[PDB]
């Protein structure tokens, strides 16, 4: 068949976040609260257009929003966040329940500065509407034309002509 | 990889122990040394003869009950379902049916040993 069209390394080049998973989980709730709109736009485009090559711009926007978020944290709340993700990184599961004083101090810092409020229980996990100017793909599966059904026969149900017509049986 | 490594280490350790146990001490074996043990007398018959089993029905019941265990074992993931009423009813039905089978066999003396 036809060859596959996939973008080049220059199109796939972006400023990646060289940030560990414990750091991400420490900053998880505020990243989900502040950078929510761009992330939801990227998830909407990914779940509408199944092709990942149609969403590279949205992915780069997501990376840019995450970079801006972490740069803001580094600018204002460096030390409490540093000790918070360190205490998170000590645990094997990175459980939130082991480090609550560091979480409280980091939350206080990002509350008195930057006005950020941690999301409550059940807020990040609910379905949100999102406004976008990207058109809805009418044929996401690249489906061919469906074959037409059989020409169903209509009409009144007349009796059988000359009975059953089974050999010599009259009716 | 780590589990395979420690299993192999256990295998090597036990093989080394039985190998040194068989090649370290002095060997002196003769016919009466290696004849089978029957409390000082010769065995009347071979031990490969048929040996009657008085709990064979309980063993077959154990096969069926072990498969009932296999059915009941996905419960710790089944309790996470959205429709907990259906799961609870189905689990109750399964355990009640198992208990009724056990009670019927107990009534019909299947748990008792033959002879």
């Amino acid at each position: 068949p036809g060859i596959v069209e996939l973008p080049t390394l220059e199109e796939l080049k972006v400023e990646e976040v060289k940030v560990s998973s414990a750091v991400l989980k420490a900053a998880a709730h505020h990243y989900g609260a502040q950078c929510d709109k761009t992330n939801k736009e990227f998830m909407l485009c990914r779940w509408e257009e199944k092709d990942p090559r149609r969403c590279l711009k949205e992915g780069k926007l997501v990376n840019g929003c995450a970079l801006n978020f972490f740069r803001q944290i580094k600018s204002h709340c460096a030390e409490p966040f540093t000790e918070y993700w360190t205490c998170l990184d000590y645990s094997n599961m990175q459980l939130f329940r082991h480090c609550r004083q560091q979480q409280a101090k980091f939350d206080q810092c990002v509350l008195d500065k930057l006005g950020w409020v941690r999301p409550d229980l059940g807020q990040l996990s609910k379905v949100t509407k999102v406004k976008t100017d990207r058109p809805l793909p009418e044929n996401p599966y690249h489906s061919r034309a469906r074959p037409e059904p059989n020409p169903v026969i209509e009409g009144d149900l007349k009796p059988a002509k000359h009975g059953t017509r089974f050999f010599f049986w009259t009716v | 990889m780590n589990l395979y490594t420690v299993i192999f280490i256990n295998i090597l350790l036990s093989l080394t122990l039985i190998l040194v146990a068989f090649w370290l001490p002095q060997m002196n074996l003769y016919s009466e040394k290696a004849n089978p043990y029957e409390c000082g007398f010769d065995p009347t018959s071979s031990a490969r003869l048929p040996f009657s089993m008085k709990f064979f029905l309980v063993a077959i019941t154990f096969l069926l009950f072990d498969l009932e265990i296999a059915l009941l074992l996905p419960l710790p993931w089944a309790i996470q379902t959205i429709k907990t009423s259906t799961m609870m009813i189905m689990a109750f039905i399964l355990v009640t049916i198992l208990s009724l089978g056990l009670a019927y066999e107990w009534t019909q003396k299947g748990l008792e040993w033959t002879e």
Partner: protein, 98 residues
Amino acid sequence: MPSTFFNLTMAFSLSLLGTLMFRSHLMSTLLCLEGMVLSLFIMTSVTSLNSNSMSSMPIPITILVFAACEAAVGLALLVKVSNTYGTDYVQNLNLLQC
């Protein structure tokens, strides 16, 4: 996966060949039946795991349940045969020709 599935199919073929080619031991025939069952379970399980068909993952457990009921009934019949004859010999189980 295809080499593994071919080996599992050949294992089923060998177990079926053992079932179809009797020796003196009905217990050995039942063991060949259980080997066929085991090959079927492994084939179904690796197919479900390869295709990520968690909806069809209860099917191997159902196979095990019904096959264990089959093995249970076979053991009960072997008990009856041994009570009749003293052995489980298929050469003793032959008096229905006339």
